[PDB]
Design a protein around this ligand. Structure first.
Ligand SMILES: CC[C@@]1(O)C[C@H](O[C@H]2C[C@H](N(C)C)[C@H](O)[C@H](C)O2)c2c(cc3c(c2O)C(=O)c2c(O)cccc2C3=O)[C@H]1C(=O)OC
Ligand SMILES: CC[C@@]1(O)C[C@H](O[C@H]2C[C@H](N(C)C)[C@H](O)[C@H](C)O2)c2c(cc3c(c2O)C(=O)c2c(O)cccc2C3=O)[C@H]1C(=O)OC
Ligand SMILES: Nc1ncnc2c1ncn2[C@@H]1O[C@H](CSCC[C@H](N)C(=O)O)[C@@H](O)[C@H]1O
Ligand SMILES: Nc1ncnc2c1ncn2[C@@H]1O[C@H](CSCC[C@H](N)C(=O)O)[C@@H](O)[C@H]1O
Lengths: 333, 333
């Protein structure tokens, strides 16, 4: 009743996440951590009005991201210190309006259009569809790859383990980001070679990362388009968090091109999510609707797509954050 | 540590308030309350895709606004029933993107600009400054007046009581919305007459409301502009939640025009807020920054403005939601 009003007001509140986002984009906590105690030093480091920044700090204190320690000095709280840039969970970057994802969340402001039409709303705001906007803006293209690659060192270890590489000769990582998954498979299967197929811009950072990993001998990088014939056959084609970017009819074209590049005996491996993990799942799934018109799919939806592409789901293996991921294995129907 | 990640993600989350806002704008709960049990009936009442609306409902269930009662039937929770349209707290309308305020919260998406410049960001989005956009869009103009007038029946009773009307002949309600405050003063002081000075559009709804109140005999309505000479003198000039819409230099011009329309012995009465009331206060104050470039002011800020307009603060009286309001009394310096 009395709390029913307060819970709705807090859940319906738009200023609160933009205050956090401004704080991240201003790099407020790093500037506090670099020794800006007063509001005056802090406005001067961030190029902001002193009195407008106090009003933001005041809200930041009241949502728990900041404390007034000495009168006028402001310290990050324990929640607030997750906004430091070197912090392992990368949450400052994921809330930076200057970067690709927190920029893309602005599409949620036209959420009604996406519910009415089913189509993404990103284009209405920024001019081109998600990945064309990145193709034209190298800062956003780069920002996107490092945001998604923020756990490349550990996030592919468990999926790579989950699979038997003994009879695999080559591996095709289709849209494999910076190559972290090809890298994990290389450091577990010492006899396997790999190719990463990615877009312009990303090919150069994946190559640079695989070089500095010591793996340019074993993992190549081909620039290309996975809607066209893949540049070589393989015994394993990896799609890690790719098909969720796409509506069903495009997802099928991707899976068909892979089925064609599949060698005799081959398997297609899909790495994606399953079903506060409901709030984690609901955020990613509403993000795919409003950015790209993709979706997270259930098991019965996968057999649909798979059947439509000439494939069958062999098995589903179940694998750092509170969330279980899946590894779908697909062979010719 | 583990909760530090979850608290930041929830506080930085932009989809969650837009999901609530979409639900309000779609009038989802009223349609459920009018007996749409299934998602199919519900998509057809709201003109939405069935599968996109299930994804929104799914997030609405997980933030507590909805429950799955029978498989596929969805009921509002106790929080969620605050989104019913006839509910006294009017929270459906305050979250409706079609209405003036939830439409204006979109300015919070450019929050960094307001911190850097101190200037409102509403104009950058919608073409004209806040009140010019309303002057051109009668639906928004009307929406704004009824949103602010949602407690006209009770919200002015305590301020009206707090003041002695015995020697007051006339009262000028400067920017008095739909006239609810002139109305409260009339129903307590039976010998006082009043004028409401308001903008185009609002004058007609205030007149209609004061008519249906039985008070068109005692309370007049003049259309006008409070930056120009007021249309008549008075012994009491009321500014209820007006000066917070304005930067200091404009606030002074408003107070100067009032000082001039003040009769011998007169008093200027300012009705505004004071200092989870910190979250209530911080929302209204960041709203005034991003919509109009106004601000909530402390006591020492009031003496500033007051001194600048030729006035002095006589006293401050302290007065339904968890929040204390103030009534400042101002006389010639
Ligand atoms: C924070 C959890 C997760 O990292 C899960 C998930 O990230 C997982 C797997 C991810 N992996 C695919 C490399 C990596 O290990 C990361 C640290 O954890 C995830 C996330 C976000 C995105 C995506 C995510 O996959 C996207 O794929 C994505 C995309 O393909 C295109 C545009 C945007 C995105 C994403 O924003 C994250 C998420 O669910 O946030 C709610
Ligand atoms: C919900 C609390 C309150 O009603 C207080 C406050 O509302 C109070 C006083 C208000 N009164 C001035 C008539 C009325 O009784 C209402 C029910 O409660 C308030 C509110 C909102 C606004 C405003 C508010 O004054 C505005 O004045 C305002 C404006 O002048 C111009 C544009 C927008 C607004 C507002 O959005 C509300 C608020 O603080 O929300 C956070
Ligand atoms: N038509 C296309 N051809 C090839 N790659 C594409 C593509 N459209 C999108 N992509 C790539 O698909 C990737 C999916 S998002 C990154 C996911 C990555 N596998 C990871 O798990 O970290 C993006 O990096 C994008 O550059
Ligand atoms: N230049 C101007 N002249 C007169 N009224 C104005 C004005 N600029 C804004 N206003 C009015 O000032 C009001 C302030 S908001 C409504 C507050 C009202 N007193 C209440 O307490 O309910 C608005 O209704 C708006 O129409």
């Amino acid at each position: 009743q009395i709390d029913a009003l307060r819970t709705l007001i807090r859940l319906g509140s738009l200023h609160t996440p933009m205050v956090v986002r401004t704080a991240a984009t201003l790099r407020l906590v790093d500037h506090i951590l670099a020794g800006a105690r007063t509001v005056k030093a802090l406005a001067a480091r961030t190029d902001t009005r002193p009195e407008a920044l106090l009003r933001l700090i005041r809200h930041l204190v009241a949502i728990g991201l900041l404390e007034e320690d000495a009168p006028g000095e402001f310290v990050p709280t324990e929640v607030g210190e997750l906004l430091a840039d070197d912090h392992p969970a990368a949450q400052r970057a994921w809330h930076d309006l200057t970067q690709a994802v927190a920029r893309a969340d602005i599409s949620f402001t036209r959420l009604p259009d996406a519910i009415r039409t089913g189509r993404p709303t990103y284009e209405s705001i920024y001019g081109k569809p998600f990945y064309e906007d990145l193709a034209g803006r190298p800062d956003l293209r780069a920002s996107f790859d490092s945001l998604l690659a923020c756990d490349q060192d550990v996030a592919f270890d468990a999926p790579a383990a989950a699979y038997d590489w003994t009879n695999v000769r080559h591996v095709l990582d289709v849209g494999g980001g910076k190559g972290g998954f090809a890298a994990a498979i290389a450091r577990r299967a010492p006899h396997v070679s790999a190719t990463v197929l990615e877009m312009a811009g990303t090919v150069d950072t994946a190559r640079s990362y695989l070089k500095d990993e010591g793996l340019s001998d074993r993992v190549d990088v081909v620039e290309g388009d996975f809607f066209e014939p893949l540049p070589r056959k393989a015994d394993a084609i990896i799609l890690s968090f790719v098909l969720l970017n796409w509506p069903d009819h495009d997802a099928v074209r991707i899976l068909t091109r892979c089925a064609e590049a599949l060698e005799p005996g081959g398997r297609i491996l899909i790495h994606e999510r399953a079903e506060t993990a409901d709030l984690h799942f609901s955020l990613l799934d509403l993000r795919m609707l409003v950015f790209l018109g993709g979706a997270l799919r259930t098991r019965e939806k996968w057999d649909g797509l798979a059947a439509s592409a000439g494939l069958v789901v062999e098995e589903v293996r179940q694998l750092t954050i509170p969330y279980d991921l899946s590894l779908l294995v697909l062979a010719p129907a």
